[PDB]
A and B are shown apart, each in its own frame.
Chain A
Amino acid sequence: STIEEQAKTFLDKFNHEAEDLFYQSSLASWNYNTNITEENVQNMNNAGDKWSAFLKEQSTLAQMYPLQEIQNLTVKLQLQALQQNGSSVLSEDKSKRLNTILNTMSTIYSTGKVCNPDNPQECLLLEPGLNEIMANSLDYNERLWAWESWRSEVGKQLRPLYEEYVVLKNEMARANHYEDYGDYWRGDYEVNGVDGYDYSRGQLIEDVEHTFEEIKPLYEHLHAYVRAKLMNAYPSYISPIGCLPAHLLGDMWGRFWTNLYSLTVPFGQKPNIDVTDAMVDQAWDAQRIFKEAEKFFVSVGLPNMTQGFWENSMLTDPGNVQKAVCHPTAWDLGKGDFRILMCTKVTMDDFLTAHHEMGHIQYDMAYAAQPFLLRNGANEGFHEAVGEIMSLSAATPKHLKSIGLLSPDFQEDNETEINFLLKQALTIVGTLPFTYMLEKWRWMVFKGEIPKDQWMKKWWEMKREIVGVVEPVPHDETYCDPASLFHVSNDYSFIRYYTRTLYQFQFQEALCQAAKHEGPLHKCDISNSTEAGQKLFNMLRLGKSEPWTLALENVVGAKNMNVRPLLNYFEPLFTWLKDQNKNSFVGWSTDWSPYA
Chain B
Amino acid sequence: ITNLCPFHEVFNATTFASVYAWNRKRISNCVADYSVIYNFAPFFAFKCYGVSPTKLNDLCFTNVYADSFVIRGNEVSQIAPGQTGNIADYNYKLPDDFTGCVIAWNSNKLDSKPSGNYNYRYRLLRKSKLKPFERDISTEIYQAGNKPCNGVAGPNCYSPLQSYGFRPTYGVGHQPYRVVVLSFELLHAPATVCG
- Which residues from chain A sit less than 8 Å from chain B, CB to CB? 1, 5-6, 9-10, 12-13, 16-17, 20, 23-24, 27, 61, 64, 306-309, 312, 333, 335-338
- The reply to whether A308 and B155 form a contact with Cβ atoms under 8 Å apart is no
- The reply to whether B156 and A6 form a contact with Cβ atoms under 8 Å apart is yes
Min CB–CB distance B118 → chain A (angstroms): 9
Query: What are 30 inter-chain pairs, A to B, with CB distance below 8 A?
Result: A1-B146, A6-B144, A6-B145, A9-B125, A9-B144, A10-B144, A10-B156, A13-B124, A13-B162, A20-B165, A23-B165, A24-B116, A27-B169, A64-B156, A307-B172, A308-B169, A308-B170, A308-B171, A308-B172, A309-B171, A312-B169, A335-B170, A335-B171, A335-B173, A335-B174, A336-B171, A336-B172, A336-B175, A337-B169, A337-B170
CA distance A335 to B165 in the complex (A): 10
CA distance A307 to B108 in the complex (A): 14
| Residues in B154-171 with C-beta less than 8 Å from chain A | 155-156, 158, 162, 165, 167, 169-171
Give 5 closest A-B pairs by Cβ, nearest first: A336-B171, A335-B174, A308-B171, A20-B165, A336-B173
Min CB–CB distance B111 → chain A (angstroms): 16
Residues of B within 8 A of A312 (CB): 169
CA distance A16 to B72 in the complex (A): 14
Residues of A within 8 A of B174 (CB): 335-336
Chief secondary structure at chain B's binding surface? loop
- The reply to whether A12 and B171 form a contact with Cβ atoms under 8 Å apart is no
- Which residues from chain B sit less than 8 Å from chain A, CB to CB? 116, 124-125, 142, 144-146, 155-156, 158, 162, 165, 167, 169-175
Q: A10-B156, A23-B167, A337-B171 are in contact. List 4 more A-B contacts (CB 8 A).
A: A27-B169, A333-B169, A336-B172, A337-B169
Residues of B within 8 A of A23 (CB): 165, 167
Residues of A within 8 A of B144 (CB): 5-6, 9-10
Min CB–CB distance B23 → chain A (angstroms): 24
Residues of A within 8 A of B171 (CB): 306, 308-309, 335-338
Residues of A within 8 A of B156 (CB): 6, 10, 64
Min CB–CB distance A278 → chain B (angstroms): 35
Residues of B within 8 A of A306 (CB): 171-172
- The reply to whether B124 and A12 form a contact with Cβ atoms under 8 Å apart is yes
Name the CB-closest residue of A to B175: A336
Residues of A within 8 A of B116 (CB): 20, 24
Residues of A within 8 A of B169 (CB): 27, 308, 312, 333, 337
Residues of B within 8 A of A308 (CB): 169-172
Residues of A within 8 A of B158 (CB): 9-10, 13
Residues of A within 8 A of B125 (CB): 9, 13
Min CB–CB distance B195 → chain A (angstroms): 42
Min CB–CB distance B28 → chain A (angstroms): 39
CA distance A14 to B145 in the complex (A): 16
- The reply to whether B124 and A16 form a contact with Cβ atoms under 8 Å apart is yes
Name the CB-closest residue of A to B108: A308
Of B142, B146, B169, the most chain A CB neighbours within 10 A belong to B169
Residues of A within 8 A of B165 (CB): 20, 23
List the count of A-B residue pairs having beta carbons below 8 Å apart: 53
Residues of B within 8 A of A338 (CB): 171
Min CB–CB distance B89 → chain A (angstroms): 14
Residues of A within 8 A of B155 (CB): 61, 64
CA distance A242 to B124 in the complex (A): 69
Min CB–CB distance B144 → chain A (angstroms): 5
CA distance A448 to B148 in the complex (A): 50
Name the CB-closest residue of B to A13: B158
Min CB–CB distance B101 → chain A (angstroms): 27
Name the CB-closest residue of A to B142: A9
Residues of A within 8 A of B175 (CB): 336
Min CB–CB distance B122 → chain A (angstroms): 10
CA distance A9 to B123 in the complex (A): 12
CA distance A27 to B124 in the complex (A): 26
CA distance A335 to B173 in the complex (A): 8
Residues of B within 8 A of A336 (CB): 170-175
CA distance A10 to B169 in the complex (A): 28
Min CB–CB distance A466 → chain B (angstroms): 47
CA distance A10 to B158 in the complex (A): 9
Residues of B within 8 A of A24 (CB): 116
Residues of A within 8 A of B167 (CB): 23
- The reply to whether B170 and A16 form a contact with Cβ atoms under 8 Å apart is no
Name the CB-closest residue of B to A333: B169
CA distance A338 to B171 in the complex (A): 8
Min CB–CB distance B188 → chain A (angstroms): 45
CA distance A339 to B158 in the complex (A): 34
Residues of B within 8 A of A307 (CB): 172
Min CB–CB distance A51 → chain B (angstroms): 14
Residues of B within 8 A of A335 (CB): 170-171, 173-174
Min CB–CB distance A280 → chain B (angstroms): 34
Min CB–CB distance A334 → chain B (angstroms): 9
CA distance A365 to B146 in the complex (A): 39
CA distance A20 to B172 in the complex (A): 16
Min CB–CB distance B58 → chain A (angstroms): 39
Min CB–CB distance B30 → chain A (angstroms): 39
CA distance A17 to B118 in the complex (A): 12
Min CB–CB distance A365 → chain B (angstroms): 10
Min CB–CB distance A442 → chain B (angstroms): 40
Residues of B within 8 A of A61 (CB): 155
Residues of A within 8 A of B146 (CB): 1
Residues of A within 8 A of B142 (CB): 9
Min CB–CB distance B84 → chain A (angstroms): 16
CA distance A491 to B180 in the complex (A): 55
Name the CB-closest residue of A to B86: A12
CA distance A13 to B162 in the complex (A): 8
Residues of B within 8 A of A17 (CB): 162
CA distance A6 to B156 in the complex (A): 7
Min CB–CB distance B55 → chain A (angstroms): 36
CA distance A336 to B125 in the complex (A): 25
Min CB–CB distance A580 → chain B (angstroms): 53
Name the CB-closest residue of B to A61: B155
CA distance A16 to B175 in the complex (A): 16
Of A24, A306, A336, the most chain B CB neighbours within 10 A belong to A336
Name the CB-closest residue of B to A307: B172
CA distance A306 to B173 in the complex (A): 11
Residues of B within 8 A of A16 (CB): 124, 162
Name the CB-closest residue of B to A5: B144
CA distance A336 to B171 in the complex (A): 4
CA distance A441 to B125 in the complex (A): 51
CA distance A335 to B144 in the complex (A): 28
Name the CB-closest residue of B to A30: B169
CA distance A337 to B162 in the complex (A): 21
Residues of B within 8 A of A27 (CB): 169
Min CB–CB distance A549 → chain B (angstroms): 31
CA distance A306 to B165 in the complex (A): 20
CA distance A308 to B165 in the complex (A): 17
CA distance A17 to B145 in the complex (A): 20
CA distance A108 to B86 in the complex (A): 52
